[PDB]
């Protein structure tokens, strides 16, 4: 229901912020950003006070494709990694509630055991974790509607 | 445009179309004190609700999005921030408990059974309506992320 | 959600009225230590005398006769009652587990009308039954 | 203590545990008997002792089904059905074929509730025992439903 949402005193985004800016080349990305050169490096520099806004990190990740910036990001708050999702939602919300409730039932399932937790059904209860990720993913999309 | 086929999956992190970090901006300033919540945050509560506010220029930086969602224990922002590049929401584990399956199973079903409260309402959908079947998603993933994990242990 | 509402048939009235024909008034009234004639007038709808909630839980353990409870639901729409006699001996969160397995397998079922058949119907009903069981299993459970 | 245990026999069974009686005292905790008995055409005095465990007043059968239809609440029956150690009701006046998925998804949001109160660390008042309780009942009327729908 609750989390106890945490700042890591590590410099998870600082790190990320140097690897980032070591990766690419901040001329091009700068330009393809709209962003002054200097600005872009001041703003991965963790030694400058300038700062990214949110869609200026959303246009370098969008850009680059790499979520460096936004791992660092989620690493700070003690967050695992970001993962992409692209599908599109084709179906009513209440299906995909349904759905959901069925790999649901069958995590509860193989959390009550009844039977040896083998190799073949941990993978078939990550199998129902993934499918259930995505059925909820969609049902969020459904409501774009 | 129109004829040119879907191309948006084949690329990571692309730029939703969608104002998903907007309307997460905004569910989140109903739902805080902003008075209460600028005092915390040692900043001025009106410019916390101008970096709330997308007609306005000011915007959060990462360190003040780490201290809000700190502050308030509420990932919207985040989880907003995060929908805004084709990104599932966060998922924190500074409280992850191995050993505890069941306990991340029965909390995914409180979330999928608030989900399912909201399919079947008669109700005109509300903003906040929407946002709370969002977070109840959100929530959702969390736990199922969480089990995952803790399917390590069983 | 519901839309309970009283029905106009008497369901209630010929249930009482089988109740009385079908047992003994005299040894019934005695043994519930009530009158025989207070007992047809309960029975009898045609007088205004009517049963209170714990003549009718006595009356019903008495003759293990669901007659009168099976009218008294079917006067607002209700089916017939269904008695239970398991003990919990579980703790809660495990009844809730199996719960969401049966409710997720019955969740299984239906989504697409497409699949259809009967064989599925068995085993969502199969399913239906083993989550009301869990869910009657909580509420005991709730009893510590 | 030495016969051996043979409730599981015997059907409705008058329960030891008094749950008609704490169902009238949530029923009136949660109406105003005043607007009720209004409605209802009763005295506010003698509805409120009919709810009261602790006076000898007790409702009539069209009384509770009166208050069943006014308020939409089965609080009382079902409370009248644990007595006997029975499940709760089932109204099927709006049974329909076509609500399958609907009453699917109302028992995912009742066993969503008591599956809040199954993981909770705070203690388990009367109050939160009672609403678990009530979802539980819910539930089952739901999965009913779902066996009706399917005729």
């Given at each position: 229901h609750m989390f106890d949402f945490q700042v890591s005193?590590?410099?998870?985004?600082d790190?990320?912020?140097?690897a980032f800016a070591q990766r690419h080349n901040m001329a091009?990305?700068?330009?393809?950003?709209?962003?002054?050169?200097?600005?872009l490096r001041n703003?991965?520099?963790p030694e400058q006070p300038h700062q990214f806004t949110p869609?200026?990190?959303?246009?370098?990740?969008?850009?680059?494709?790499?979520s460096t910036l936004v791992d660092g990001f989620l690493a700070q708050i003690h967050c695992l990694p970001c993962v992409?999702?692209?599908e599109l939602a084709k179906d009513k919300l209440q299906s995909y509630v349904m759905r959901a409730?069925?790999?649901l039932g069958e995590l509860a399932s193989?959390?009550?055991?009844?039977?040896?937790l083998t190799t073949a059904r941990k993978h078939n209860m990550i199998e129902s974790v993934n499918s259930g990720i995505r059925m909820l993913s969609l049902s969020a999309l459904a409501l774009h509607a």
């Open positions: 005193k590590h410099p998870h985004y790190e990320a912020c140097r091009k990305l700068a330009e393809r950003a709209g962003m002054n050169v200097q600005t703003k991965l520099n869609p200026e990190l959303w246009l370098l990740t969008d850009l680059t494709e790499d992409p999702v692209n409730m069925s790999e193989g959390a009550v055991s009844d039977e040896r």
